[PDB]
Amino acid sequence: LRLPASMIIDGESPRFDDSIIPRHHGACFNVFIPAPPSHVPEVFTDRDITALIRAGGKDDELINKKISAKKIDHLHRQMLSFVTSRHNQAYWVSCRRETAAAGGLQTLGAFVEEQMTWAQTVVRHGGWFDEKDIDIILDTAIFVCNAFVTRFRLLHLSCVFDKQSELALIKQVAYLVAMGNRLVEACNLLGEVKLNFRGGLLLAFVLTIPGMQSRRSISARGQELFRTLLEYYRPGDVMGLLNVIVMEHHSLCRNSECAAATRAAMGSAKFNKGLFFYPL
Amino acid sequence: LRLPASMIIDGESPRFDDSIIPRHHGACFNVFIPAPPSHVPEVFTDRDITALIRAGGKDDELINKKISAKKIDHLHRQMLSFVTSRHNQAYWVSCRRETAAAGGLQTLGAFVEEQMTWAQTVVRHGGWFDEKDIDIILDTAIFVCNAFVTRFRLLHLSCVFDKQSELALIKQVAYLVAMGNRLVEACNLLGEVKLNFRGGLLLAFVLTIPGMQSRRSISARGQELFRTLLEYYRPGDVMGLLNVIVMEHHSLCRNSECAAATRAAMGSAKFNKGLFFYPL
Ligand SMILES: [Zn+2]
Ligand SMILES: [Zn+2]
């Protein structure tokens, strides 16, 4: 009965419940969800990302989505076209959004790798994020970040980070992002902090792109941080950090629910729709 | 800004650091998670819960896993001799844990329907929520409930639920369940308020089993609420409410992002391993 703002609470309780449940529609094996943007103008782009876009529609192993960054800054010539193509826009965003929601940290990590590598390329070849220019990868970047942090909290963090205050910051940042409403305070708290440790740097790596997309309502130190992070970023980093963190702790901690919560928190990597490229 | 507990702020602003990142392992495609529980001893069961079990090893469509409440009422002492088997425990709990952990609201709704129907049955034959007496479906009940609500938080609830009071309840209850282990506070809150709307009744339906497993720590209203909710529930209620909220909303809310979040959060129902039965 610590209730801000409600009006009618029960005075008995009576209590009853039957009327509102639709018991007459019978079984329901599928929920009547709105239609997807299945409509694809089916634009054929050139000259040979055909297999790369078809890979952006499959769920192969990550081992089948490799590109060395040499190719990325090379084929950027019209990869920027495909991503900014006014055709097929909300479709890929929807596809990539529906997978980012669910789930498994391995998948979301690879997504961050791709979106970090892409953004580092599109600032290398000139051009910062307008307010706001249309672009598939960066438009889903915020969805990737939130879903990453949220599926991240399902780790036994009290066990993985056997550190005093590191765990405190990580817990608060993961909290701030997980409530959705408060990102500017999550990504600006990251900034006036030490980042010697791994886990906080891993979160800062994730909040790079969305920290940049919001670089107007944030602190002064934040912009310096995320621009530095994107500048000195390299591919395979986020997966490296995440991997070595889980590797070492579970090389030691042979608990039960810790190994379980970890095993659950990162599902298989097979699920990729719609992942275009895994950078290396 | 305000930082309660920390040891070293930064005035200096050092960089980067690059040594903390293990840049020498190279390429990572599968994170090195601990081993999965070993299945394949199997229990030599027998007509005909094998067919039921085998449905727990496959990602079939919901309709292919259907069952009638009259059947699982008949098939009880048999089915109970499996879910309470000495062997193959943490395996099936892991399968269910990881699936609900990734899966979307449709998958989790099926799990909820199953576990509620199962608890109804084992109660109907004198059983009770022992702690612990090893019931696969009731162990996973916490993970299902949590993950359901954590993903329920993806919908544009400000657009799905009109009156600010019902919405406010849904938002706070979701905040408690999803964020932290403040579960008992949530069950108390559901216990206070009259549930004559589909949002609160749906969530309360989800939390019945974890509430009934926390019967000692929960307020009087909570104990009576979840007792009655467990007795008067009849299969389909959860999906029926979930569906009918979506259906009746998006039949007049053609908002691009509201339907986008709804599509992303629901997710396909083909993923359900291991879902033993979908009750009717
Ligand atoms: Zn551990
Ligand atoms: Zn709406």
Numbering used by the authors:
A (entry chain B), B (entry chain A): 175 to 454
Sentences from the paper on this structure:
KSHV encoded multifunctional protein ORF57 plays a key role in promoting viral mRNA accumulation and translation. Previous biochemical studies showed that ORF57 is stabilized by dimerization, which is critical for its function. ORF57 comprises of two domains with distinct putative structures: the highly disordered N-terminal domain (NTD) from residue 1 to 166, and the helix-rich C-terminal domain (CTD) from residue 167 to 455.
Two kinds of ORF57 crystals obtained in our experiments were used to collect X-ray diffraction data separately. The spindle-shaped crystal crystallized in the reservoir contains 0.8 M Li2SO4, 0.1 M BIS-TRIS propane and other crystallized conditions shown in Table 1. After data calculation, the cubic crystal consists only of monomers in the crystal asymmetric unit, while in the spindle shape crystal ORF57-CTD forms a dimer in the crystal asymmetric unit and the resolution was relatively lower. The dimeric crystal belongs to space group P6422 and the final structure was refined at resolution of 3.5 Å with R and Rfree values to 25.9% and 30.6%, respectively. Moreover, in the dimeric structure, only residues V168-L175 and S455 are unidentified because of the poor densities. The arm extends from the globular domain of the same monomer to dock in a canyon on the surface of the globular domain of the neighboring monomer like a barb. Thus, the arm region in the dimeric structure lacks two unstable small η-helixes. PDBePISA analysis by comparing with other interactions at the dimer interface showed that the “arm” region makes major contributions, mainly (>75%) by its hydrophobic residues, suggesting the “arm” region very likely participating the dimerization.
